[PDB]
Amino acid sequence: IVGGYTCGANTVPYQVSLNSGYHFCGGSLINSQWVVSAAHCYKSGIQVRLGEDNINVVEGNEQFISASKSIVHPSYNSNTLNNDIMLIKLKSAASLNSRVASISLPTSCASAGTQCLISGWGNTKSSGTSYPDVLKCLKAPILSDSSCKSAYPGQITSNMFCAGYLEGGKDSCQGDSGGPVVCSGKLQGIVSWGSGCAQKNKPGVYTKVCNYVSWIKQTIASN
Ligand SMILES: *[B@]([O])(O[C])[C]([C][C][C][C][N+])[N]C(=O)[C]([N]C(=O)[C]([C])[N]C(=O)OC([C])([C])[C])[C]([C])[C]
Ligand SMILES: [Ca+2]
């Protein structure tokens, strides 16, 4: 997260770290057995790590559970990053408590102007690299579809939104992919792509979760 702040241990209780030997992407716990992340975070042999603050120290609140199956969206296009959403089922249900909690799925899409919380263990520098060990948070508004489409001419689909600052300085970055964008308590976005990080006039782009709620409910219901 570039230009954000330290969340505080377990204050974002639905944040997961996806681990295949090291943290490679974030995700959101949406019920005790299912995680939603970005389809570009797909790989085999993912262990889901819940209740993390420092991803390098076992502090006591963690639950490390293997993925039993991954389902990438049926229309994910890695070239356009259109439909960048994937579901991960855990092998066993997690024990939910105040430090491990699921986030609600939206019933409506959120408006431009809505302030959101974005979180992750990704790069904190816009030039060069420094990966944090503890979770970082950022508050950023949803941008209008006009601003988003003029920042990225020809790249924004109806399943994408921009959230951030046109002045730059604050943004998600490498290592934040798959993580939550939560606005008014509902999961509204997934960290997906952008032109670098915290670049002027180049805000982050996010998968628009409200478009996928029937696919998410149907897949959970049958798997
Ligand atoms: B993610 O992979 O973290 C593990 C990361 C989050 C980036 C957040 C940006 N606000 N996502 C990516 O790296 C994705 N790629 C890009 O965002 C690339 C670098 N952007 C890009 O090439 O920009 C253009 C030149 C305009 C197309 C990919 C999906 C891994
Ligand atoms: Ca830890």
**In sequence order, what are the residues at sequence separation of 6 or more whose Cβ sits closer than 8 angstroms to the Cβ of residue 20?**
43, 45, 46, 47
Closest-CA residue to 138 (of 116, 165, 114, 123): 116
3-class secondary structure, 38: coil
CB 202 within 8 A of CB 167: no
The resolution, in Å, is 2.0
Q: Would you say the CB of residue 40 lies under 6 angstroms from ligand 1?
A: yes
CB 67 within 8 A of CB 29: no
In DSSP terms, 88 is beta-bridged to 35, 70
Is position 84 annotated as part of the catalytic site?
yes
Q: Could you say which ligand is closest to the alpha carbon of residue 55? A: 2
- Residue 146's CB is within 10 A of a number of other CB atoms, namely 9
Domains of the chain as residue ranges with CATH: 1-12+103-210 (2.40.10.10), 13-102+211-223 (2.40.10.10)
d(CA 160, CA 140): 16
Side chain identity at residue 200, one-letter code: K
Joined together, the tokens standing for residue 218 give: 């149907």
Joined together, the tokens standing for residue 20 give: 């295949």
Q: How was this entry determined?
A: X-ray
Burial per residue of 12-30, b for 16 or more beta-carbon CB atoms within 10 angstroms, e otherwise: bbbbbbbbeeebbbbbbbb
CA distances, 203 to each of 37, 83, 169 (Å): 20, 19, 10
Q: Would you say the CB of residue 135 lies under 6 angstroms from ligand 1?
A: no
Q: What is the dihedral of CA 118, 124, 130, 135, to 10 degrees?
A: -30
Closest-CA residue to 115 (of 167, 179, 169, 181): 181
Q: How many angstroms separate the alpha carbon of residue 101 from the centre of ligand 2?
A: 16
Instruction: Tell me which of 84, 102, 119, 176 is the catalytic residue.
Output: 84
The alpha carbon of 83 is separated from its chain's Cα centroid by a whole number of angstroms, namely: 14
d(CA 56, CA 156): 36
| Closest C-alpha to ligand 1, atom 29 | 193
Side chain identity at residue 131, one-letter code: Y
Q: Would you say the CB of residue 164 lies under 6 angstroms from ligand 1?
A: no
Q: If you ran DSSP here, which 8-state letter would residue 106 be given?
A: P
Residue by residue, what is the 3-state secondary structure of 35-99? EEECHHHCCCCCEEEECCCCCCCCCCCCEEEEEEEEEECCCCECCCCECCCEEEEECCCCCCCCC
Q: Would you say the CB of residue 175 lies under 6 angstroms from ligand 1?
A: yes
3-class secondary structure, 40: helix
